[PDB]
Write an enzyme that holds these catalytic residues in place. Structure first.
Site, short mmCIF file in Angstrom:
data_model
loop_
_atom_site.label_atom_id
_atom_site.label_comp_id
_atom_site.label_asym_id
_atom_site.label_seq_id
_atom_site.Cartn_x
_atom_site.Cartn_y
_atom_site.Cartn_z
CG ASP A 1 -3.49 -3.36 -1.55
OD1 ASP A 1 -4.63 -3.33 -2.08
OD2 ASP A 1 -3.33 -3.59 -0.33
CG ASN B 1 -11.97 -8.78 1.71
OD1 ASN B 1 -12.31 -9.57 2.60
ND2 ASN B 1 -10.74 -8.28 1.63
NE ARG C 1 -4.39 -1.35 1.99
CZ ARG C 1 -5.43 -1.20 2.82
NH1 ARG C 1 -5.28 -0.65 4.02
NH2 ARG C 1 -6.64 -1.62 2.44
CB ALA D 1 -17.17 -13.09 -4.67
CE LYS E 1 -1.46 -4.69 2.60
NZ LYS E 1 -1.97 -5.30 1.36
N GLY F 1 -20.18 -7.24 -11.59
CA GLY F 1 -18.87 -7.06 -12.21
C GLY F 1 -18.54 -8.32 -13.00
N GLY G 1 -24.31 -7.00 -7.16
CA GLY G 1 -23.26 -6.59 -8.08
C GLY G 1 -23.03 -7.59 -9.20
#
Lengths: 336, 330
Positions: B112, B244, B42, B242, B78, B165, B163
């Site tokens: 990310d 998050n 990030r 699906a 991370k 997508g 959704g």
């Protein structure tokens, strides 16, 4: 908090290791000239800020101690928050895993609370550990000659007066080296038995611990104590040159260097002359070769002449000169 | 710092720094037991030094639990950089690339927020889709039916899909092609009309979808949908989707589901199709093998539902215990 301090000191990275109950910090200042070198140190720190600050200060130190010495190496340091009473082999083996993680970026050694048998315990898991007196002693003997060249202009030490604190193995070998080049010695040791031996061996005139600072001599060579060049005792120095094997010599680097400068006394930086001890450890890392190691210590001689030359041209202390000489060596090294 | 790490159980926390590129970076490594630590990079500007750490710590712990449950040989890591989106050099990213490399394949970074697919190229050699993700949930649905209803055929059942997508669409296909009646929703109406025509679903508004009395709810649009406003309106007995971070509140809304008797399929285990795709790219992509490794979602889940009923705990608490016990063996 942490990041701001790094900007002032110039560290590369800082690892906060944890798991065998561990609280450990590897700090790595630079890796420019080679892999970072710095010894493991166990102390029960007051708080993590204290642990960190000790790790940042000494790691920096190793960058400068390596650069001046002219070994291909950077400056690192590793610390562990624990009480000496609270230890085990697994804790050191766990700590061993962490130096191994670094893949030879950080090569460690021994410091307070890490015994040579501890170093072995660590070693098996990691292989990046390592583990002196005669080379340190010769390193000064070179540093002494180097300092004579700056002011006096000759290489003959015949009929020169010198004083030595500490007749420990490291310090007494210096007396030996000096005596064998027809030097007149004054000698000081904190206990009575060792001081008597040197008298017999070299015809040096034994003095009490307190007297040695004031003697009407050319050179002063402390080899047992740190924090001796201080506002109490520093005024009595009649020595033209200050070359010795002891570490942490100046009580206050910035203050007490100027005291010597302003009163015309030459101070060879402690950590450049002590480097003989570091160059010893270096060779063991790369596999010990006496032939090369005994050459590599001649850097102290070359290094110091430059530091004294740089002190004069720029109009500045040897300690400031040693920084610029260390710094520029790293800066210039980016091509190779 | 150290005491907080005690609570979380991290291995290393590297604070990386440079002068010329002038980058403030923190790689945080939670675990390396099952393999090298995986973790995406990030680059959000953080108000404080304590803040940037807390993001690096909370996500590196997550990637342990997302990797363990998925049954891949990998840890949890991370990486974060404190920088304005505005501020980014090619050198800055190259510098960061030297820092991930130093870890010698102990930290495998990823893409990310604010770091694009060509920044990933700009960046070491330790860096790294929709169909395999949407198959992952399709297996997760099947798995979820078995725990509650003891049946392997899905035909005639009723499912809601939030959704549409690429991810959301492929799900409706797989469900339609197994004779499932579909209710659909998309946050923009443009692509809802295509799913009506392609598969013969009943298109509802964005708000209406929570209320429908259907067998199962499959959200695939956004996180933070299962919340105290929404969570009472659900008739649906199963929630395998699906998207998050579906549960708005970590522990508060997972209990409500349990309380009402709606069983929840963990967000992170279902999305593993996405991860396991990324995993297979690291080693050198083989579709033949990757398409098998996703079936760990089906297998894993059945246990997560089973282990819940055994000890009488939520499916998230259950999913912690599985990840942990997978680590503790390995």
């Amino acid at each position: 908090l942490l990041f701001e301090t790094v900007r002032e000191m110039g560290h590369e990275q800082v690892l906060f290791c944890h798991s065998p109950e561990i609280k450990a910090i590897i700090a790595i200042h630079d890796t420019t000239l080679g892999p970072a070198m710095g010894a493991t140190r166990i102390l029960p720190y007051i708080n993590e800020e204290a642990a960190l600050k000790d790790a940042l200060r000494l790691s920096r130190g190793m960058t400068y101690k390596a650069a001046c010495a002219n070994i291909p190496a950077g400056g690192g340091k590793a610390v562990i928050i624990a009480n000496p009473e609270n230890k085990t082999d697994d804790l050191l083996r766990a700590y061993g895993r962490f130096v191994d993680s670094l893949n030879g970026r950080f090569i460690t050694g021994q410091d307070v609370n890490i015994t040579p048998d501890d170093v072995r315990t660590i070693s098996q898991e990691t292989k990046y550990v390592v583990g002196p007196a005669p080379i340190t002693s010769l390193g000064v003997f070179l540093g002494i000659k180097a300092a004579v060249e700056s002011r006096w202009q000759s290489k003959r030490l015949d009929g020169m007066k010198v004083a030595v604190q500490g007749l420990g193995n490291v310090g007494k070998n210096l007396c030996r080296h000096l005596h064998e080049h027809d030097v007149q010695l004054f000698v000081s040791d904190v206990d009575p038995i060792k001081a008597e031996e040197v008298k017999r061996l070299f015809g040096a005139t034994v003095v009490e611990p307190t007297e040695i600072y004031s003697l009407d001599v050319d050179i002063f060579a402390p080899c047992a104590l740190g924090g001796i060049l201080n506002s109490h005792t520093i005024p009595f120095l009649q020595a033209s040159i200050i070359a010795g094997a002891a570490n942490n010599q100046l009580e206050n680097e910035q203050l007490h260097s100027q005291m010597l400068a302003k009163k015309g006394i030459l101070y060879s930086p402690d950590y450049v002359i002590n480097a003989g001890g570091l160059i010893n450890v270096y060779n063991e890392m790369i596999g010990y070769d006496e032939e090369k190691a005994f050459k590599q210590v001649h850097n102290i001689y070359d290094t110091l002449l430059a530091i004294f030359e740089i002190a004069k041209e720029q109009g500045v202390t040897t300690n400031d000169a040693a920084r610029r000489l260390a710094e520029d060596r790293i800066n210039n090294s980016k091509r190779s």
